[PDB]
């Protein structure tokens, strides 16, 4: 036997159940934005405990396992993917990924072990980096006009979410500044996988 040695065994989710959340396939940046908006308006948790997490790399090709789009043991290769991180006040982190087949929410270490996996044996151009943006800053600064989701004739590659584009007073499109993992660009902090797990893991 091994003791763990605060443990959020009675943790109450910060969102409704998965199937009650606003969701559009291939718009995880907006799915996460809508979770942040829910948390802000629900007055259950401080918004400052929550983070939007962009996952990508220089070549924009990241594997993620346990994804609903490819049931089974293989990964989805995304250009980028976004999840919500809640660092609960006792220190235990939870990941909210509407696209995972893992629990919603999922303990941080379980998500990193099963959905992300180690980069040690991954071909280097597929290795993952993480941009972590406070949810308040994400709601204040993110904007997307969805122009990246159209084909060469201007028609939707994937059907858009059923509400108007997210925009701010300062921008109608800055998605590339969140997908970027250049720390000189955008908002938040950029981590390698080992830095990310060192920072938030138990």
Curated annotation (Swiss-Prot):
The protein's Enzyme Commission number: 3.5.1.122
Main localization (coarse): cytoplasm
Active site positions, chain numbering: 28, 81, 97
Cellular component aspect of the GO annotation: cytosol; nucleus
Keyword Methyltransferase: no
UniProt keyword annotations, A-Z: Cytoplasm, Hydrolase, Nucleus
Reactions mediated catalytically: N-terminal L-glutaminyl-[protein] + H2O = N-terminal L-glutamyl-[protein] + NH4(+)
Signal peptide: none
Cross-referenced InterPro entries: N_Gln_amidohydro_ab_roll_sf (IPR037132), NTAQ1 (IPR039733), Prot_N_Gln_amidohydro_ab_roll (IPR023128)
Localisation: Cytoplasm, Cytosol; Nucleus
GO MF annotations, alphabetized: protein-N-terminal asparagine amidohydrolase activity; protein-N-terminal glutamine amidohydrolase activity
Biological-process GO terms, alphabetical: protein modification process
UniProt similarity note: Belongs to the NTAQ1 family.
Its job: Mediates the side-chain deamidation of N-terminal glutamine residues to glutamate, an important step in N-end rule pathway of protein degradation. Conversion of the resulting N-terminal glutamine to glutamate renders the protein susceptible to arginylation, polyubiquitination and degradation as specified by the N-end rule. Does not act on substrates with internal or C-terminal glutamine and does not act on non-glutamine residues in any position. Does not deaminate acetylated N-terminal glutamine.
Record's subunit section: Monomer.
Protein name as annotated: Protein N-terminal glutamine amidohydrolase
Source organism phylogeny: Eukaryota, Metazoa, Chordata, Craniata, Vertebrata
């Amino acid at each position: 036997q091994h003791m763990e040695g605060p443990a959020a065994v009675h943790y109450q989710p910060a969102s409704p159940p998965r199937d009650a959340c606003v969701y559009s396939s291939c718009y995880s940046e907006e799915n996460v934005w809508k979770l942040c908006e829910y948390i802000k308006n629900h007055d259950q948790y401080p918004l400052e405990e929550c983070y939007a997490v962009f996952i990508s790399n220089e070549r924009k090709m990241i594997p993620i396992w346990k994804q609903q789009a490819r049931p089974g043991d293989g990964p989805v290769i995304w250009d980028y993917h976004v999840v919500l991180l809640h660092v609960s006040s006792g220190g235990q982190s939870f990941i909210y990924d509407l696209d995972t087949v893992l629990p919603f929410p999922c303990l941080f270490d379980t998500y990193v072990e099963d959905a992300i996996k180690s980069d040690d044996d991954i071909h280097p151009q597929f290795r993952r980096k993480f941009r972590v943006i406070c949810a308040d800053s994400y709601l204040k600064n993110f904007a997307s006009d969805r122009s990246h989701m159209k084909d060469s004739s201007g028609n939707w590659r994937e059907p858009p979410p059923p509400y108007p584009c997210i925009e701010t007073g300062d921008s109608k499109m800055n998605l590339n500044d969140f997908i970027s993992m250049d720390p000189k660009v955008g908002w938040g902090a950029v981590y390698t996988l080992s830095e990310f797990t060192h920072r938030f893991g138990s």
